[PDB]
Structure formats: C-alpha cells, structure tokens
C-alpha cells in the first residue's frame, strides 16, 4: 500500500550494434519509498562504475532514476539490471533484450 | 531598500490620537512590522502586517499598509504617557533570498502628561541616615516646562519623569538636583528654565 | 528561481 | 520564545565570550545584532537552517554556529572595547507571517582594566516638610551613585512588596563626569505616596539596586571589595513627623 | 507549444543516523536545470543544464540560501507530520513537494501548482484558483487551517502568477537552442514470432524531444486501442527519450496493422507498416 514496487526497463542509449561502444541504461520507476539499490551486471558480474540521474518523481509521487554505464555489446555477452527495494524480498534481475 | 520615518520626532499631550509615518522604496516586500523600544529596555513587537493585508489592530494601536505606494501608518488612540518611546518599522523582502530585514531609524515619540491643576514647587529632601546630605526636587510642574541640563560639573540634574498614583488617578512630573559641593541649598540648583510662575520655594528653617 | 518564503505544514 | 543569556556581562580585553540564544518556536531563521547607544540595529550574522550561517554587516570578531534548530550561539573570539554594546538575538519563520521575535538583549562592556567597575552607592531621601502640608503627598527620592558600568535594575519595596504605582526612575542614568569617557553613573528614582501613608510609622520603605559587575571568578587586587554582581539598598521609615 | 517550470523536493527521515535527506531538483519542460543534495559536499545549488550557467553568483548564493531554508522547513515538517498521525520515531517517512507554473504557446500564464505529499500520498494541494486548498485527510485540515490563517495562498499567488513565469520566460529565451528545440523521433518497427500462431509488432520511436508523444496502432484504419502494449516513455540518457508500443497479431494479418507516430518535431504524422 504505502509502498510501490519499481518498474524496470533495461536498454541501450543508442541502437545496439555488436562490437560498438554504447551505454547500458536501467530505468527504475513507479516506486516508493525512494531508497533503492540498482546494479548492472555483465555475465552476472556486477559492473563497478555506474552513474545515475538525480532523484525526481512523477505526478502520482512515485520516484524514478536512470542508472547508466558504457558497454560494448556482443553476441554471447549477457547484460542485466539487478534491483533491490523494500518491496522486494529477492534481488530482482531483468535481462537485457536488444529488441526491447 | 530604504525605510524612512518622518517626522523623526513627535511631541504631543496625552489624550491626542496620533500618527507615525513609515516609507519604503522597494514595494516588493513580504511584510512590515512595527516595534517599540525604550532607552535601556528591549524591542517590543506591536503589529505585523503581511504584504497581502491592510489595517491591523491591537488595543489602542492600529496601522495600515499601502504597499503599492510604499507607505505604512501607525495610529494610536488616546495617547498615554507610557506610549513615550521610539517606534520603528522594518520590512522584509518578497525575494532576493536573504530574509534579512531592513529597519528605519524610527521616530521619537514623547507623550507629555496633562497635569490638570499644576502646582510648581521645589522641595529639599534629606538623607534618612546622614543629615547634611540632601537633594532638590522640582515637582508638580506643567507639561509646558522644560528642565534644561546643568552647566556645573558638580551639579547633577536628572530629566523629568512622570509618575502615576493610579488609585488616586493623579500624575506628576519631577526632576532631581544634588551636589557634594558646599555651595547651594536648592533655590539656585534649577537656574536654567525655572519658570517661577508659582515655583513655591519653601523657607528651609 | 525557487520560491523564497515557505510555510511549515 | 527567544531567551538570551547573559543579560549583563563584563569582560577584559582578550577574553572569549559566548552569548547564547535559543528559541522553541521551530524558527529556521535566527539573527544577531548589536546596537550601540541610539544608533540602530547592525546585523552581525544570520542563519536560515541547521548547518548554515551567513555574514551580516559587522561579522568581525564574531563567530557563529547553528548545530541545531533551537540554538544560535554568538561568540567573540578575542574581546575588544569597540565591541562594548547591546546585543540582540532575533528569530522568525522563514515563511508564515515572517514575524521577528527579539530576545531580551545582552549588555556587554569590555574594559582594558577591571578596576573602574564600581558598585552603586544607594541613599534614600525623606519627603519634605513643606510638600506634605502643601500637597498632602509624600515623595521619597532614591539616588544610586558612583556605579559602573551602567548595568543596574532599580526597584522600590514598600512593606516587603515590590511597588510600581507612584514610581518613576530616570529612563537612563547620567554620567557623573560627562567629560570623561569611562565616567561613573548616577540614577535617581521617585516613589510618591499619600501624606497619611508617609506619616504612619509602621510603613517601611526600601530602595534596592541590583548591580551586574564581575563574575565571582574574575581576577582582582584592590583594597576595595571585589565589585561583583550584588544588591545595594537603602531604606527609610514612615514618621509621624 | 506549452512550457513549464517545476521544482521537485524530497525529504526522507533517518530514524537514527543523521539529519533527514533533502533532494531538490528544478526543471524547465522535460529538462533538469538545477539540483541540490544534502549529502553532496557542495552544499550549493548546482547547475545541471548548459544555459543558466550565465546566471551570476548572486543568483547561486540566493538559490543555495533559499534551498537550505527549504530543507529546514522540511526537517521540521517531518516532525510535525509524525505528530499529526502520532507516529513512532522508529520508521522513516517521506515528505514530497512540487510547485511551479505553466505557460501557453504564447508564453501567457495558464496554471499554477503547489502540491504536498506524505509517504507517497496526497496531503494538501492548492486548488487551480490559487486561493484555497484541498486537504486529503484530517491531518491536513490542520495544515490547511494554519495556512489560510498565515495567508499562505495569497503569498504564493504572487510567485506562481508572476515571479515563476518571469523566470520561465527568461530561461526559455536564454535556452532557445536547447529548450525551443524539437527533435523528431527516429522511427522503425520490429517483428518477433511470439506464440506459435501469432507475431508481435513493436513500433519504435527513438531520440526525440520533448517527451510528449503519441504512438497509435491501427487495424484496417480503426485504431485497436485496447491490445496495445505501451512502455512508459523513458530517457535515452542523452537528453532525448525513447518509447514503444506493440501489438500481437495473428501471423499473416501483419499487413493489416498500422502504427501512427505523433510528435511536435514531426511535420506530418508518420504511419508505418511491416
């Protein structure tokens, strides 16, 4: 009730082309409270440098943040966003699909 | 920006309704506040007018705000001698981001007591422990009587202050003069603005 | 530019 | 409200002093002023919140902090005579009415030499013979003299109860030696009662003067009683002439 | 089109590990331009968009000073609010605020806002007339009662109705190159066999600005509105946005469907077909 679980979409800044530098985004939304933990994973490994936008919120008062990091997509390399929040009991993983 | 309050001084007799002016250059203000300060005493807030408002009242005090024309007026009903003090108006800015207020230098208000049937006189009071040591008391004098200061460094003269015998609804002005010197015995002490219409000078002994 | 005066709830 | 402490204080040049100020109105804005004798408020520092402070007009020799919402202490690192003045703490919401709330005030006096601080001499003068017969009233005059600094509070006590009706003390004291910079002060006060009252031998009159001088723990070496904060009073009794 | 300046504020209490966190952000249309953070070492209003940097120090000192006054007010609102709901001091709570204004295509004033929330739910808000309030619950009755006592709304009027829009027009012309800008959406389409008897068609719109957009699927010209999956418009990370809409159609019937893309930077509405 007083809590909204986040929405998670993971995608790239520019169209994905194997072997070309790009930025892996992870956009979390519609959540509350504000405390949230978000990581980006390369084949499970947690990616060390990741930046994020300043906290803001929608008209319904839910928070939203953009986590981003540069990466070079390939065929076999698997990417994902891993999110944790008070509404979640398990870290929440979402695999990156380039057609989405 | 700049707060002005003129007349800078104001002298009237008790009972008269009076006005205190206040003017500001920058109309963009959040409020205007009237204070009161007596020498040695603190500042006492009187009224607080928000920029959105006009006529605010408290007791015999009443004040308007014409923020358009950068002006405020403080009204006072039936002036009491107790009103005598310095009145200040200060403002605070609608914006600018400092909340720092701006004061005027205030107007000097002196409300003289109405001594119905005056009886000017100068008595000589004596120390209740050691004789010799005495004091002079100009008293019961009219509101139209200034008590100029001493010209003699060994002569001390305190200004007039009005005291009130409330249960007897009676008020009276009085000044004090004294010396360590072996020279005068009253009679001479107040040589300045004496106004001896009837200054009853008791005949000592 | 931010608002200057804010009242406590 | 806003409470300031201390109200009176005396310092020798070089001492570090802290004037406290506190409010319980949850005001975000607190400010410090110094007002020299009939000059005008001069802003020293102000703060809009816990953790922040900003300079005013005269921040020199004055440090400030805002560790909490309620307290805004002002400190003089190293006391100087030029800082002898009356300090005013003032707070307000940073919204709502935006009404200022001033503290009681604090009188500091910085002296390069603690000798010069004198307690008052208090004497009471009895009503005149002529007055009573001529006016049917009796005016007692209390006279406080030789004190320094100008930090005193005078009250009249009749039959053990503070009285206010029939009193008027000088708004302010006068320099016994106007030529001198550090002249000692004098102050006169009047208590007027009805003749019949002064003529009753049972009636007890007393004039007291509370003086604010040296902190008990201040240095002192003079064949003269340490001019500490104290009370000096004189009294007189009613007389059937 | 229209324009707007918004200021968002968030304050979260921390049961027993420091002051509450304050985060303030300012926007013009869909572009953040300032930000303040209690926990950042700056302790100043920071520029977050290129224009605006032309504003002098007096401006920065001011906004920095004002935004700290905002953090105190909220530091307090956190305690008073517990009191209204008589809540423990044990769990953290959140206080949010959003005020600002809107202007028409001609930069003329339209609307004003000043809303407040506690724990993600409406608490109190200024009606469109900028003169009265709407209290969500009994606690807010109190905030409302003292606000109409302290003539709050009358004081805001001044700001929303003027200061707010004056600054907006100012930022609007200093930022022409960024703000007045319009970026049409780089558009295209997807096809992936979903189930064994159907295939998803996803209509893409990329790197567009402003965020306002409309993606519409049709079948035989009649727009099949329900059956259209829309993701929340999301940022690209570079100042532009992305969005898609999809429909799963019986395989073979793909020629019949149509996607329609409306956007300000677009001279005439697009329509795509697989």
């Amino acid at each position: 009730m007083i809590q909204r679980t986040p929405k998670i979409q993971v995608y790239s800044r520019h169209p994905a082309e194997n072997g070309k530098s790009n930025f892996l985004n992870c956009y979390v939304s519609g959540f509350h409270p504000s405390d949230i933990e978000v990581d980006l994973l390369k084949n499970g490994e947690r990616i060390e440098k990741v930046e994020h936008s300043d906290l803001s919120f929608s008209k319904d008062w839910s928070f939203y943040l953009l986590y981003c990091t540069e990466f070079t997509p390939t065929e076999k390399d698997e990417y994902a966003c891993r999110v944790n929040h008070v509404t979640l009991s398990q870290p929440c993983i979402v695999k990156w699909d380039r057609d989405m | 920006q700049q707060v002005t309050q003129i007349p800078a001084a104001l002298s009237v007799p008790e009972g008269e309704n009076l006005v205190l002016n206040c003017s500001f250059t920058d109309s963009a203000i959040y409020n205007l506040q009237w204070f009161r300060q007596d020498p040695g005493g603190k500042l006492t807030s009187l009224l607080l007018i928000q920029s959105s408002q006009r006529e605010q009242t408290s007791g015999r005090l009443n004040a308007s705000l014409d923020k358009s024309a950068g002006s405020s007026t403080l009204y006072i009903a039936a002036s009491q001698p107790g009103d005598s003090a310095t009145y200040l108006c200060a403002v605070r800015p609608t914006s600018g981001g400092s909340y720092i207020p701006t004061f005027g230098r205030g107007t000097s208000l002196i409300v003289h007591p109405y001594i119905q049937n005056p009886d000017p006189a100068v008595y000589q009071l004596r120390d209740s422990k050691s004789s010799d040591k005495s004091v002079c008391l100009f008293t019961d004098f009219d509101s139209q009587t200034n008590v100029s200061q001493s010209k003699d460094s060994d002569v001390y003269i305190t200004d007039k202050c009005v005291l009130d015998m409330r249960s007897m609804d009676f008020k009276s002005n009085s000044a004090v003069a004294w010396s360590n010197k072996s020279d005068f015995a009253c009679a001479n002490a107040f040589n300045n603005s004496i106004i001896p219409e009837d200054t009853f000078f008791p005949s000592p002994e | 530019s931010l608002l200057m005066w804010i009242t406590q709830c | 409200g806003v409470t300031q402490t201390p109200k009176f204080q005396v310092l020798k040049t070089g001492q570090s002093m802290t004037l406290q100020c506190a409010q319980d109105m949850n005001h975000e804005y607190m400010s410090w002023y110094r007002q020299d004798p009939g000059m005008g408020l001069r802003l020293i520092h102000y703060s809009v919140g816990a953790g922040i402070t900003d300079q005013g007009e005269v921040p020199n020799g004055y440090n400030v902090s805002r560790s909490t919402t309620e307290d805004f202490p002002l400190r003089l690192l190293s006391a100087a005579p030029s800082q002898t003045s009356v300090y005013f703490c003032a707070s307000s919401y940073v919204g709502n009415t935006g009404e200022l709330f001033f503290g009681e005030g604090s009188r500091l006096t910085v002296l390069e030499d603690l000798k010069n601080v004198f307690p008052p001499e208090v004497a009471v003068f009895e009503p005149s013979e002529a007055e009573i017969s001529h006016t049917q009233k009796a005016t007692l005059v209390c006279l406080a003299t030789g004190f320094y600094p100008d930090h005193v509070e005078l009250s009249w006590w009749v039959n053990g109860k503070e009285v206010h009706s029939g009193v008027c003390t000088d708004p302010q004291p006068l320099k016994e030696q106007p030529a001198l910079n550090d002249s000692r002060y004098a102050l006169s006060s009047r208590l007027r009662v009805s003749a019949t009252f002064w003529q009753d031998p049972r009636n007890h009159f007393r004039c007291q003067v509370q003086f604010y001088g040296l902190s008990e723990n201040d240095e002192w070496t003079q064949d003269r009683a340490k001019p500490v904060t104290q009370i000096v009073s004189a009294e007189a009794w009613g007389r059937a002439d | 089109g229209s324009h707007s300046m918004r200021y968002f504020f968030t304050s979260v209490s921390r049961p027993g590990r420091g002051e509450p966190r304050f985060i303030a952000v300012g926007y013009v249309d869909d572009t953040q331009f300032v930000r303040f953070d209690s926990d950042a070492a700056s302790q100043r209003m920071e520029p977050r968009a290129p224009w605006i940097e032309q504003e002098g120090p007096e401006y920065w000192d001011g906004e920095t000073r004002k935004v700290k006054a905002h953090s105190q007010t909220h530091r307090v609102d956190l305690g008073t609010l517990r009191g209204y709901y008589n809540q423990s001091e044990a769990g953290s709570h959140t206080v949010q605020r959003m005020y600002g204004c809107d202007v028409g295509s001609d930069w003329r004033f339209l609307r004003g806002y000043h809303q407040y929330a506690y724990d993600g739910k409406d608490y109190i808000a200024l009606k469109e007339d900028l003169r009265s309030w709407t209290a969500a619950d009994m606690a807010a009755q109190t905030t409302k009662h003292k606000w109409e006592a302290a003539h709050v709304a009358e004081q805001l009027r001044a700001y929303l109705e003027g200061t707010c829009v004056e600054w907006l027009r100012r930022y609007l012309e200093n930022g022409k190159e960024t703000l007045q800008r319009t970026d049409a959406p780089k558009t295209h389409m997807t096809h992936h066999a979903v189930s064994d008897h159907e295939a998803t068609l996803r209509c893409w719109a990329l790197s567009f600005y402003p965020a306002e957009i409309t993606l519409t699927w049709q079948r035989d010209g009649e727009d099949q509105t329900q059956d259209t999956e829309l993701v929340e418009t999301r940022p690209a990370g570079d100042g532009t946005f992305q969005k898609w809409a999809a429909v799963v159609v019986p395989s073979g019937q793909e020629q019949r469907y149509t996607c329609h893309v409306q956007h300000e930077g677009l001279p005439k509405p697009l329509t795509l077909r697989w």
Side-chain angles (χ1 to χ4, degrees):
Chain A
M1 197 168 299
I2 153 182
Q3 304 176 347
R4 265 74 81 32
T5 210
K7 292 187 170 186
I8 312 171
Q9 34 194 341
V10 39
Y11 54 109
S12 59
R13 177 180 301 173
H14 306 272
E17 297 193 61
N18 289 334
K20 314 190 75 167
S21 178
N22 202 168
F23 279 83
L24 176 53
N25 287 156
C26 180
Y27 184 68
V28 288
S29 295
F31 67 87
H32 193 109
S34 171
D35 287 0
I36 195 173
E37 182 184 336
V38 177
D39 285 337
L40 307 181
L41 283 50
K42 173 171 187 176
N43 300 324
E45 303 297 52
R46 178 267 213 165
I47 303 172
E48 299 172 40
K49 179 168 186 177
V50 171
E51 293 189 350
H52 64 267
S53 63
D54 307 336
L55 177 65
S56 179
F57 57 84
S58 297
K59 80 81 189 169
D60 68 356
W61 304 110
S62 49
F63 299 102
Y64 67 80
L65 284 57
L66 186 279
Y67 288 76
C68 56
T69 272
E70 70 164 5
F71 80 134
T72 311
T74 59
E75 277 286 302
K76 46 176 164 58
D77 287 323
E78 300 180 24
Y79 292 99
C81 191
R82 187 291 312 177
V83 181
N84 206 341
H85 189 251
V86 290
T87 56
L88 294 165
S89 52
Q90 287 178 174
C92 188
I93 302 283
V94 180
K95 302 178 180 185
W96 165 64
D97 187 12
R98 66 176 68 204
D99 312 341
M100 204 175 310
Chain B
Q1 171 62 19
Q2 291 196 204
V3 178
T4 312
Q5 308 183 49
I6 50 70
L10 194 61
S11 169
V12 306
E14 63 166 321
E16 286 192 359
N17 303 313
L18 56 69
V19 173
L20 295 175
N21 297 146
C22 170
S23 56
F24 46 103
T25 310
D26 188 340
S27 298
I29 56 73
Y30 191 72
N31 67 197
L32 187 153
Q33 184 172 341
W34 286 84
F35 299 86
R36 163 171 186 168
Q37 181 177 18
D38 313 15
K42 56 152 190 164
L43 281 76
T44 303
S45 185
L46 299 180
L47 303 170
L48 182 298
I49 317 174
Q50 304 190 237
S51 59
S52 321
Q53 311 299 320
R54 297 169 170 264
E55 293 287 352
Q56 189 153 58
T57 314
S58 179
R60 299 185 292 98
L61 307 182
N62 171 208
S64 70
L65 182 63
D66 185 17
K67 70 160 292 181
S68 57
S71 300
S72 169
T73 297
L74 177 54
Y75 297 93
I76 303 184
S79 310
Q80 287 176 181
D83 298 327
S84 304
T86 304
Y87 294 71
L88 301 167
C89 66
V91 300
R92 305 182 75 176
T94 185
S95 72
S98 61
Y99 312 96
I100 192 277
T102 296
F103 285 92
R105 303 208 189 190
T107 72
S108 179
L109 178 60
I110 310 179
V111 181
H112 297 85
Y114 165 72
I115 304 191
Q116 185 171 141
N117 200 17
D119 183 356
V122 171
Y123 306 104
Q124 184 174 174
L125 295 55
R126 176 156 291 185
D127 172 32
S128 75
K129 281 208 164 192
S130 173
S131 307
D132 200 63
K133 194 174 62 180
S134 63
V135 169
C136 296
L137 178 63
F138 176 52
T139 180
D140 297 23
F141 54 85
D142 194 343
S143 58
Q144 193 188 203
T145 288
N146 287 342
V147 177
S148 49
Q149 291 303 150
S150 181
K151 61 64 182 297
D152 185 315
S153 60
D154 195 349
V155 174
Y156 307 120
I157 309 180
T158 71
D159 197 357
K160 324 166 298 175
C161 73
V162 50
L163 58 70
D164 183 348
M165 302 185 60
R166 302 169 195 171
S167 73
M168 274 168 38
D169 199 11
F170 174 93
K171 295 185 181 62
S172 60
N173 284 313
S174 44
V176 189
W178 70 93
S179 281
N180 184 222
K181 192 60 191 299
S182 172
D183 199 12
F184 69 86
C186 292
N188 181 162
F190 288 97
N191 285 162
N192 56 36
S193 171
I194 54 295
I195 58 75
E197 56 184 349
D198 302 311
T199 54
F200 170 65
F201 281 107
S203 188
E205 303 179 339
Chain C
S1 183
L2 281 68
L3 166 76
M4 181 165 177
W5 305 87
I6 39 289
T7 297
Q8 302 185 355
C9 77
Chain D
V2 188
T3 56
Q4 300 184 211
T5 70
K7 295 60 62 188
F8 298 97
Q9 181 68 228
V10 175
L11 299 180
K12 197 170 192 295
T13 56
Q15 296 172 174
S16 68
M17 171 67 179
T18 296
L19 311 186
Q20 301 294 156
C21 186
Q23 51 72 212
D24 54 2
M25 289 170 288
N26 282 321
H27 291 146
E28 314 84 344
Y29 175 88
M30 303 189 63
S31 65
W32 276 105
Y33 293 99
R34 60 169 290 172
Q35 185 188 218
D36 297 2
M39 283 300 197
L41 300 167
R42 298 269 290 328
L43 180 58
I44 310 178
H45 291 280
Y46 77 95
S47 171
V48 305
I52 180 168
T53 57
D54 282 301
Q55 295 177 33
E57 186 189 351
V58 292
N60 299 212
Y62 303 105
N63 296 213
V64 152
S65 79
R66 187 73 174 281
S67 294
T68 68
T69 280
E70 297 76 25
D71 292 309
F72 188 52
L74 170 70
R75 192 181 185 94
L76 302 70
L77 304 182
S78 186
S82 62
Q83 296 177 323
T84 294
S85 180
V86 173
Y87 299 81
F88 288 105
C89 177
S91 66
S92 82
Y93 290 105
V94 75
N96 199 129
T97 275
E99 178 175 334
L100 275 161
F101 294 84
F102 280 85
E104 292 292 19
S106 293
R107 284 74 186 184
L108 272 65
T109 307
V110 180
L111 299 60
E112 286 173 7
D113 185 347
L114 292 181
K115 93 186 200 314
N116 284 198
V117 174
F118 289 93
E121 294 260 32
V122 182
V124 183
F125 302 80
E126 299 187 331
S128 173
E129 181 105 355
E131 174 177 0
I132 301 173
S133 55
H134 182 95
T135 68
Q136 300 191 226
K137 300 181 198 69
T139 293
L140 295 69
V141 167
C142 181
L143 200 51
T145 70
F147 64 95
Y148 188 95
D150 186 5
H151 296 157
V152 294
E153 292 171 326
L154 188 159
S155 54
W156 283 94
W157 294 79
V158 180
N159 289 313
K161 302 170 293 68
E162 188 170 359
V163 86
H164 299 278
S165 191
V167 181
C168 96
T169 306
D170 304 342
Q172 213 160 201
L174 62 77
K175 303 179 74 174
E176 297 180 338
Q177 298 183 11
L180 277 179
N181 181 184
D182 56 333
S183 179
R184 290 164 56 171
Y185 298 89
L187 178 75
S188 70
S189 189
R190 302 73 156 172
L191 170 54
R192 193 175 211 179
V193 300
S194 76
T196 46
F197 201 79
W198 167 264
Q199 298 187 11
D200 176 30
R202 158 158 281 321
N203 292 331
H204 183 54
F205 302 86
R206 171 197 176 87
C207 171
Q208 80 175 37
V209 177
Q210 168 70 236
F211 168 77
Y212 297 94
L214 308 185
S215 302
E216 193 69 11
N217 307 39
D218 288 347
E219 179 183 357
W220 182 261
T221 47
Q222 282 268 151
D223 301 16
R224 185 283 227 38
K226 189 173 187 298
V228 302
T229 298
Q230 70 189 251
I231 292 181
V232 181
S233 51
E235 52 199 344
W237 287 81
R239 308 183 59 178
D241 46 307
Chain E
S2 303
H3 295 285
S4 61
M5 186 173 66
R6 305 302 188 200
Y7 274 102
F8 304 90
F9 307 87
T10 301
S11 194
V12 185
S13 61
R14 308 175 189 170
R17 57 204 191 286
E19 285 76 30
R21 198 174 190 178
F22 193 65
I23 297 184
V25 171
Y27 279 81
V28 167
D29 296 349
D30 305 312
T31 299
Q32 188 186 163
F33 74 100
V34 284
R35 50 98 93 136
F36 177 84
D37 193 331
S38 325
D39 296 6
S42 165
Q43 296 302 124
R44 302 209 65 184
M45 263 295 205
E46 290 178 309
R48 224 58 176 75
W51 50 275
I52 221 293
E53 286 198 32
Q54 66 184 53
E55 300 295 352
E58 295 182 40
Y59 176 91
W60 298 105
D61 284 344
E63 307 297 296
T64 295
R65 186 151 50 248
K66 283 184 291 185
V67 85
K68 290 204 193 78
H70 280 56
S71 80
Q72 265 287 135
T73 301
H74 287 89
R75 191 167 179 355
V76 163
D77 291 357
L78 278 170
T80 139
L81 285 167
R82 299 206 326 280
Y84 295 155
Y85 297 98
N86 192 207
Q87 296 165 338
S88 170
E89 306 169 36
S92 78
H93 295 84
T94 299
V95 164
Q96 280 170 281
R97 182 192 298 250
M98 180 294 292
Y99 62 74
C101 55
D102 291 350
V103 296
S105 189
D106 55 8
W107 292 16
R108 218 79 199 183
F109 178 80
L110 269 53
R111 200 76 71 102
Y113 314 75
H114 184 285
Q115 308 171 353
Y116 200 95
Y118 183 70
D119 289 335
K121 61 194 301 68
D122 293 340
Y123 175 80
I124 193 169
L126 185 63
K127 295 280 196 66
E128 187 184 14
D129 59 20
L130 303 328
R131 298 182 192 190
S132 46
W133 310 86
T134 303
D137 60 25
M138 187 60 67
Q141 295 275 65
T142 293
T143 295
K144 175 184 176 186
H145 180 264
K146 59 158 291 191
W147 279 15
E148 50 206 359
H151 307 283
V152 174
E154 305 179 14
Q155 305 293 335
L156 298 184
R157 282 279 289 323
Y159 176 84
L160 301 181
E161 207 103 311
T163 305
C164 183
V165 309
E166 289 169 2
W167 285 93
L168 177 46
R169 302 187 189 186
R170 175 177 171 86
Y171 304 138
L172 281 174
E173 56 204 329
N174 290 171
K176 288 183 61 174
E177 296 80 12
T178 293
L179 301 173
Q180 262 78 324
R181 164 178 59 103
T182 198
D183 295 359
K186 270 55 64 190
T187 209
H188 78 286
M189 186 164 170
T190 275
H191 174 93
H192 287 91
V194 174
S195 175
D196 57 354
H197 269 267
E198 43 197 20
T200 276
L201 296 179
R202 173 165 36 251
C203 196
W204 286 93
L206 296 173
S207 52
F208 58 97
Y209 184 99
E212 165 64 46
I213 195 173
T214 303
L215 300 179
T216 285
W217 276 108
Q218 301 188 353
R219 191 182 77 174
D220 296 349
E222 201 155 346
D223 70 351
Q224 205 184 29
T225 212
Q226 74 193 59
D227 293 331
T228 302
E229 184 179 18
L230 269 47
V231 282
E232 180 191 336
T233 295
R234 68 199 185 193
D238 58 1
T240 76
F241 303 89
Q242 306 176 176
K243 190 189 196 66
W244 61 257
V247 276
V248 27
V249 312
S251 48
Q253 312 309 144
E254 305 153 15
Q255 295 287 217
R256 299 175 59 184
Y257 291 80
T258 289
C259 178
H260 294 259
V261 178
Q262 293 177 298
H263 187 271
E264 300 86 322
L266 211 300
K268 180 181 182 70
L270 281 295
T271 98
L272 311 179
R273 316 180 69 103
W274 173 245

